DNA sequence: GGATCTTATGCTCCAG
DNA sequence: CTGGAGCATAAGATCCT
């Protein structure tokens, strides 16, 4: 699959190996749509910023046609919250798991903890 | 059975030579040896005269090996010397002078064998099949290049966890239930398994079919105890027994306890009262029904998984570890005299024969009764005949004591049956004729002493020389044997050995006092020397007894050292000592790392010294710029030289011997030191090394390696021995307070009696379980003979009542089951009473007792 | 194969070849036909046309063919046909008849120290002499001919005259009897020789100078320098120069009793000394005591003029580096090591070796974090010293011990758990970077929650590092030809190694080796397939063999070993290694070898060279000589014998000379005498504060001893935590159990769900696998749940509550968690422990003190449990007065109060039935053996007496000490059994 | 004059 | 810092002729 592009990612050493094998380690062999996104949200992470709009990922298009490698299966995959509301990787916190996806935005769950941790704590 | 002399031994075919505690094995081998090398004797003599070069001498252990090279060398030397000169003193010498034809060409033999004599065929038996196959390669199948690798231990723990891997994942709840209940884990299976694996695998009684399986195993049990369920959840309902005065009419709630434990056939237990349905204890409390016998013989049958797991095991995890062994490219030493026995075994087997005869026509064996049958098999099947090839074997079976290492006596029995020649020796050197006379009445007290006759005890008369050989204590003189009966008629076993070793203590400390003050004398004929500490020496059977033993001796202030130490330095103060100096001079910036191994004991400081310490900072400062400098000379120079500088600038080596017992961790400081530089000779780096001693630290490995060695020769003191490593030895007075005891045995594990084969039982055999304890009987009277044959002067062991059973005063003590009690007894139950008067009987002025 | 010559061969390969077999078998055959091309080509030459030759032993059959079939296939390949062994020959016939100077030739050659050449290059020598001028310096110990006789047609010949350089002519004394009787034997050697030690040692010398003296055209002369009969070693090179003998041998009475004839010895000489030791550490250190000594002796002496030989050298150079690197400035004397294993850069060899053998690793966790270790590796992949601890935690904690990914678990016939494997680490490692523990599991896997900040790029770069090794392990497996091997040596150095300046060295040796060996093998055109086990232990073995003779004359002491052909004369030489069976390195054939069968004159074996180089060793010294071997090994105290060959001489020293004083005694008693001559071998100051945190009185009497270290001179025995096990814990022991035993027991405490809690661990990989871990899981359940029943019948639901009290003018702060209003409810699952009811008796005091009524109560296992009854606050603070007296007593002197051992001893003194103390000796006498017990520990439990605190204080326990720790004890530990119930 | 029955108490190696 | 063994018991203690 795409992993020949991810470690020429590697090897362009814009992005970090904590992203790639982050994004290894929440996608699995599964579709290359949450791989992908996977990816790009670790990446966000691996900077450090505790957000990310669905924006972003759908209007960059980094270094590849990601919507056009993305496509997979029958219907369209523009629709990135079912798309990955599919995925278990992402979900809304009401289970453990990695991503948070309730109002078009997608970081890491502890970031998303600590945000309404102290978002309930001033109100 | 004809008493040998080996100017007339026939040095031809086999034999076997019984040579007894202290008759001069070195000194036979040695004359015969010579003998061999000449070829004198005549008409009992080898046809041709021997090179050194065609001489196999083979010996059970390696510095047995080396004394035996040494003084057979010595023995070439002074023969020559006293052929040269045509005269000696030695009566051996000169008969054989007198035996010798020429004294030219005897002369440049006995010079040729002493210059090839280093070269001379001495090896131990692992050696030995190694060197053969190293020669004969094309014939054993074997590679060119193998090491000697001694840690089959966890290669053996690796194969235990792939089979408990591989064959005990998929099971489910009920079969793991009863597997673990029946055993932990793998740990548990190498500790049940270790000895049955260890050695050859043996001959299992009645093994289990190769198609049996664990889940038809439990559908088998299952069954079983479904289909008495059903008919007794049928049957029940009606009365027969007896209502007897024992026999309560209240007995319906065994009843009623047998109908509540119908509850389900997935459980494993059963009740108590299931087993009153045996017609026996109807006969305390009519079957009229086949339950009352189906109960009875369920009931007499054990079920479990054990004997499939057991043979399972051993049947894959040795040809695993076979394999991974010679893919590693390993080997073992019982592994290649497993490959010597399948070379044999083989078709090639006859030209290994043929190649070896030649090679060397002859072969001496040394301590036949240590020996294995895979050993003897070898020796049968090269040199069982064909003649101008000849086979002394050279044994004695009453000192054979190493049945759990791996011995056994009746491999000498089939031995002893497959050979014609039997001779014994009478000169008993190291004993006195007390102890000779004393030894004798002992061993013929009752006929068939070793409850076998086919190891009958000869009785042997001792050196003229040692006659004039009389013990003295405080005046008048002492018979040869002193036994003790204490302040008791039945007593726990205790009590027993504190009051054994408290009069031990007491007569050892008015000895040593009477030799200090010159009234006990070992004296022989006009010489007399006084006793000291090194003197007296204790034989003991176990090291927790033996430390029991040694807490009296250091109460009473007599000093206790213990000769069998098989602690490793590894585990005492110093080890850890090391890891905080090393972690601390890895990193002396840490105030507290470097605080916490600058206040220990190996500087010895004191609490207001590191008080005040805490405070100077300059002195501080100094002290860290001297572990910064000590860093800078580790990784500058090395291990050692930082130590060689930490103790000369502290001036420890001074202090450490002027306190005292400091002597003791100090030398073992220098040896820690010295087996840290060899592993950091290969542990390049410093952080591998201090990971390295954490590692040995944490894992107290018993190798010869890290065996601490004896204190100092200088300083004397009482000897706390094993009676193991006392074989071969001599001792002056000896002190046997715990061979009275004894152990029962309860593993089922037994040899034929007939056939001479190892059977391993899986089940409860009455004949397999008393066969077991009647050979480790037998065991205990080896020891006893070796015990009892190891003193020189005097030997006083002690008479006890000794009771296992609960019932203390019974009249009838359990003193039977022991070596002292059915030499003494004759295999009766006695009283204290009897033991009093079966010792007085044989009382006349060479064995005594005193409370 | 398949010749019906080669059965026994086909029988050694076809049980089972992974061309190992074929390999050493391909070595060895190699050596002897070398062997055989040098030495006795006449073989070679016969087995071209295809026969044998007679009087030779068996496996000639088998060694002949194949020699043939090897000329013939090498014909065929196209190399050229030409040798030694064929060329020698011509080569002598081509020069024999020729011009006088051919050109290219060498005007004229040198031979020196050389002793022992082929007899082929001999003769090739000998035709060679008639065109140039040739040099031989040859060192014979002797003068006169010592050499072996063949015919009597010979010993005519052997009148030959032997001129000095310039002056006149002379050779061996007495001419005609000397051949005529017995000496020169009518078939044996010479053995009226005299010197036993020339006739036992010099077997390649005798021999050597019985073939240099068979040539027709010789030019014989010599330059033979006298020695002066002064001191021991001069007067035993007289007697090997001058071929006699001195060794009395007692003919008669007369010859036995008389001891004069020999030459008396001076007794204080120091020319050749025997030494005994121990151990080799105690026998380097008396060298070099004894070196220093010589050293101060002699001013006319440089440590550059004496040498030292060892007969293994790996066995003694650690000790030699350590003593002499250890040894300080004002003794210090130069050392140079030579000859031992050439080792540069140990840990990157040791890296390379490891990572070829990847493909059938079980990738031992520890295993795969030593590779780590190496710096090289660890610029490379950027992780650095610092991130080593993080990582060492990390996968300790996470628990990983065996292989990389179920496909690697899966080829060795093993059950994929899914668990414990590297991938399974990374994915916990990365799950838990982004989640929280209280979450819970994701994909069966629990996060682990201590990685969350920025530090979590090493695991990245870790899994970086895993994900490349396991392409490699999958690349490595296959075996491919030599033609597929050449470039995977490169990609694996430049993709595993970072080339830097230290490491360009190793990295040329490794290139060139893999480069020459993959260059034999082009060159002999291989076309099958290898496996990579070969190439492995072929680089192990042209890597090890690689000796460094380099540093030999620098300025310090020599260190070598007695390196064969090799003999130069200094003033002190040395000895080591004398022992049994390790000098003269003994060393079987290869047992189908046909020279070990039919010897020759021109023979060279371990044995006869160690001798040869022992005999020239004892010429080479000039004025000190040094012997030395262990003798008695300390670990049993057994003998041990010297060699052979240090015996004979010793025993030639006891035969040649006396003593000065006793002359005449015996020989016997002069050779015991000289052989013994020869031969020898508290109170601290502390002031009470008034403000006392609770946790400080707390920490204080748990351990009173711990306390002392611990606070008052701030010492803690901070030992390093175990070692990372091997594998998957099936059985859960020690502390294991007790963090699983006690998050289990909350859990019922409150009665929630223990499902949850379970699949949680299950998640965790750190139950046994399958049902074992749920029927050992079964076993916590049915005993806490009972642990849980007595706990919850007696809870109500209670509250903290700050507690400020003031006794002894010093106040009390602190805290007291969740306490009820009958009183203390408290809980812990281990056993009835003194000190734990103390623990909470201290917290039962300020709960009194302070009002507060009610008793308080403590549950255990195994039906344990603490009760204690209220008191008035009266009496709460004066058995706490009392106890606050215990701290600054405990905390200037360290108290003599064992916790449990002294509530042991106490236990069956102390009576309730008269509630009081007990004096009756019967009872006392049940304390103490109560008391040892409780101290020293069982077969498997640990005592008290086993710990590193009260080990620093003492080591044995006195009467006097064991009252003293009784006394204090009692009086503080009067308390808890007065108020028991 | 028979029991069950639950406790205190006893007792658990050796050598490469 | 923390954690630690099973098994065969007979005396005594009550239940029942």
Redesign the pocket.
Known sequence: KLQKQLLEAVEHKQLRPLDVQFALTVAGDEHPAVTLAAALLSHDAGEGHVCLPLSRLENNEASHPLLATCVSEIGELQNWEECLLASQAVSRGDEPTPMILCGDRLYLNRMWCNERTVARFFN | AETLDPLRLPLQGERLIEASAGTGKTFTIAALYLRLLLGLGGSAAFPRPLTVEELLVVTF??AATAELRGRIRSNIHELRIACLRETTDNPLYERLLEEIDDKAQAAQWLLLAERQMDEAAVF?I?GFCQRMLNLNAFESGMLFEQQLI?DESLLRYQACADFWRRHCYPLPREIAQVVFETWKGPQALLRDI??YL?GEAPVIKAPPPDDETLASRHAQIVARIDTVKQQWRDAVGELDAL?????????K??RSNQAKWIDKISAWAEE??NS?QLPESLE??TPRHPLFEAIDQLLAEPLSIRDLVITRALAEIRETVAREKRRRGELG??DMLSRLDSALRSESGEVLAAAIRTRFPVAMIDEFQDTDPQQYRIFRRIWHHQPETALLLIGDPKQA??????ADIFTYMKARSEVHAHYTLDTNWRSAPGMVNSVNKLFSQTDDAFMFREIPFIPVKSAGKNQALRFVFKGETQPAMKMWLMEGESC???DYQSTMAQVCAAQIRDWLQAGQRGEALLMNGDDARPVRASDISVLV?????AAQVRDALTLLEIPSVYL?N?DSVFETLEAQEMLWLLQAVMTPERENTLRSALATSMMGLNALDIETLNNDEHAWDVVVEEFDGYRQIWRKRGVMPMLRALMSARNIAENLLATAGGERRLTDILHISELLQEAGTQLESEHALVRWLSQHILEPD???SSQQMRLESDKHLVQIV????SKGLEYPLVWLPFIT?F?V?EQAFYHDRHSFEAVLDLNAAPESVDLAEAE?LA?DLR?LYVALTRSVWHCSLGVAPLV????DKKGDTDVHQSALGRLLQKGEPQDAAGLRTCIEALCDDDIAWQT | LEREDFTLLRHYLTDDSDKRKLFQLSSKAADLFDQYLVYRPDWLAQWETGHLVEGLGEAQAWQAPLWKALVEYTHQLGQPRWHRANLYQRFIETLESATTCPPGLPSRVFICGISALPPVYLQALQALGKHIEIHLLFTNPCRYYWGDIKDPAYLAKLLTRQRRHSFEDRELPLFRDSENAGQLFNSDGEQDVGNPLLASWGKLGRDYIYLLSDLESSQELDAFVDVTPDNLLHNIQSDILELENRAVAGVNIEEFSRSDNKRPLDPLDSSITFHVCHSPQREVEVLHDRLLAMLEEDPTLTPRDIIVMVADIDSYSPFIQAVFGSAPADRYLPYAISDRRARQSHPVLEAFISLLSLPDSRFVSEDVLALLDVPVLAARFDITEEGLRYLRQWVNESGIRWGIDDDNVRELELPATGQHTWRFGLTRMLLGYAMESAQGEWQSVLPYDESSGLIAELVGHLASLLMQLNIWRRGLAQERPLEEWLPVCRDMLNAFFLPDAETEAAMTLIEQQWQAIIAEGLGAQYGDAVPLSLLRDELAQRLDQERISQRFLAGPVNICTLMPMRSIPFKVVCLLGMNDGVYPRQLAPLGFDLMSQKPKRGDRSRRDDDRYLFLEALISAQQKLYISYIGRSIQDNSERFPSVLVQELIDYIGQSHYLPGDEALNCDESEARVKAHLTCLQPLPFTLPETVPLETLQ?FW??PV??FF?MRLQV???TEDSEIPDTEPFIL???????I??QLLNALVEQDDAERLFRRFRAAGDLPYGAFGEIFWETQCQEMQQLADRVIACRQPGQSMEIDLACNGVQITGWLPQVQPDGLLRW????L?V??GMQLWLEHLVYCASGGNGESRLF????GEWRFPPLAAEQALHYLSQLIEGYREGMSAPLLVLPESGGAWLKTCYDAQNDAMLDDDSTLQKARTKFLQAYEG?????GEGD?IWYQRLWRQLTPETMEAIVEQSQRFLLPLFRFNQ
């Open positions: 252990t390696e131990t692992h001694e270790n000895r260890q209502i007897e005065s024992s026999g309560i009419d209240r007995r709630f065994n108590e009262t009153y305390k409390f030493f019982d004591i190493y049945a759990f290492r791996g726990g076993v205790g059977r176990s090291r927790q007894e069998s098989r018993s190798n010869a094993t009676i193991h490593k005891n152990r045995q480790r065991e020891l296992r059973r609960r019932g | 920490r748990a351990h711990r306390a611990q803690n025995f901070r022991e020690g502390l294991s159990r007790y963090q035993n006690q812990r699952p281990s056993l422990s000190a734990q255990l296992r195994k039906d069982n077969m498997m439990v640990r710990d």
